Write an enzyme that holds these catalytic residues in place. Structure first.
Site, PDB file in Angstrom:
ATOM      1  N   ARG A  20       0.879  -1.171   0.000  1.00 21.17           N
ATOM      2  CA  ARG A  20       0.000   0.000   0.000  1.00 21.17           C
ATOM      3  C   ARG A  20       0.911   1.214   0.000  1.00 21.17           C
ATOM      4  O   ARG A  20       1.665   1.428   0.960  1.00 21.17           O
ATOM      5  CB  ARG A  20      -0.959   0.027   1.207  1.00 21.17           C
TER       6      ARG A  20
ATOM      7  N   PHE B  63       1.925  10.649   1.552  1.00 19.50           N
ATOM      8  CA  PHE B  63       1.479   9.996   2.789  1.00 19.50           C
ATOM      9  C   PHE B  63       2.588   9.057   3.285  1.00 19.50           C
ATOM     10  O   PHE B  63       3.383   9.458   4.146  1.00 19.50           O
ATOM     11  CB  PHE B  63       0.108   9.322   2.599  1.00 19.50           C
TER      12      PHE B  63
ATOM     13  N   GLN C 158       3.853   1.448   2.760  1.00 11.28           N
ATOM     14  CA  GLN C 158       3.564   0.421   3.758  1.00 11.28           C
ATOM     15  C   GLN C 158       3.952  -0.967   3.251  1.00 11.28           C
ATOM     16  O   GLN C 158       3.700  -1.317   2.087  1.00 11.28           O
ATOM     17  CB  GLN C 158       2.068   0.440   4.090  1.00 11.28           C
TER      18      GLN C 158
ATOM     19  N   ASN D 281      -0.879  -0.715  12.185  1.00 13.32           N
ATOM     20  CA  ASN D 281      -1.685  -1.450  13.161  1.00 13.32           C
ATOM     21  C   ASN D 281      -3.130  -1.428  12.695  1.00 13.32           C
ATOM     22  O   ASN D 281      -3.459  -0.824  11.676  1.00 13.32           O
ATOM     23  CB  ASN D 281      -1.478  -0.906  14.582  1.00 13.32           C
TER      24      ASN D 281
ATOM     25  N   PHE E  72       5.466   1.129   8.139  1.00 13.81           N
ATOM     26  CA  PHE E  72       5.419   2.128   7.092  1.00 13.81           C
ATOM     27  C   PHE E  72       6.566   3.106   7.249  1.00 13.81           C
ATOM     28  O   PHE E  72       7.104   3.318   8.335  1.00 13.81           O
ATOM     29  CB  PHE E  72       4.054   2.835   6.999  1.00 13.81           C
TER      30      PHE E  72
ATOM     31  N   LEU F 226      -1.016  10.856  13.227  1.00 15.05           N
ATOM     32  CA  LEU F 226      -0.765   9.502  13.696  1.00 15.05           C
ATOM     33  C   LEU F 226      -0.023   9.469  15.025  1.00 15.05           C
ATOM     34  O   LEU F 226       0.120   8.382  15.606  1.00 15.05           O
ATOM     35  CB  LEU F 226       0.018   8.711  12.640  1.00 15.05           C
TER      36      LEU F 226
ATOM     37  N   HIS G 246       0.261   5.341  16.300  1.00 14.73           N
ATOM     38  CA  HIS G 246       1.213   4.387  15.747  1.00 14.73           C
ATOM     39  C   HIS G 246       2.552   4.595  16.430  1.00 14.73           C
ATOM     40  O   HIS G 246       2.969   5.746  16.644  1.00 14.73           O
ATOM     41  CB  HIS G 246       1.350   4.584  14.217  1.00 14.73           C
TER      42      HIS G 246
END
Length: 163
Positions: A53, A58, A61, A100, A111, A120, A124
């Site tokens: 992903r 961003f 991942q 997660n 990531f 985040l 995370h």
């Protein structure tokens, strides 16, 4: 602190090496999980798996070496493990953090941020950062999309510990 590497290809063509410093001085349990999954010393780990992903502006991942789609993975601790602490923050590109599925659900997925993802923080666990090969991360990012599906197959062809 350990230094580990990811060697990454796109459709079989090398993109280069990402070198990561793991902050064992702040999050030892989270750093150790990632270190051992890079070396493969427990018989399983990241080698041969994908960045599944990738979303421009961003993050990129990876780490789902069981299902290859963001649903799987495996920690070194027998089960998902708790959020160790939220001391380190998502300050900018190159931050290495745990993916997660909610609180206390760390496995193997991770990531690498390509922007400051401050929303985040506290959600995370950050545990390291890129020290070499951010340009490789930018190349991975360039194969991403709004949905996160990649336009080439992005594979961790080798990985391990440097020091």
């Amino acid at each position: 602190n350990p230094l580990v590497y990811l060697d990454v290809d796109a459709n079989g063509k090398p993109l280069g090496r990402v070198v990561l410093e793991l902050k064992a001085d702040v999050v030892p349990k989270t750093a150790e999980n990632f270190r051992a999954l890079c070396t493969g010393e427990k018989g399983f780990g990241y080698k041969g798996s994908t960045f599944h992903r990738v979303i421009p502006s961003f993050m990129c991942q990876a780490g789902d070496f069981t299902n290859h789609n963001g649903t799987g993975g495996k920690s070194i601790y027998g089960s998902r493990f708790p959020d160790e602490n939220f001391t380190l923050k998502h300050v900018g590109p190159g931050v290495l953090s745990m993916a997660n599925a909610g609180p206390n659900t760390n496995g193997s997925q991770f990531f690498i941020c390509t922007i400051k993802t401050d929303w985040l923080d506290g959600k995370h666990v950050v545990f390291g950062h890129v020290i070499e090969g951010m340009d490789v991360v930018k190349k991975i990012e360039s194969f991403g999309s709004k949905s996160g599906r990649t336009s080439k197959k992005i594979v961790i062809t080798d990985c391990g510990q440097l020091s």
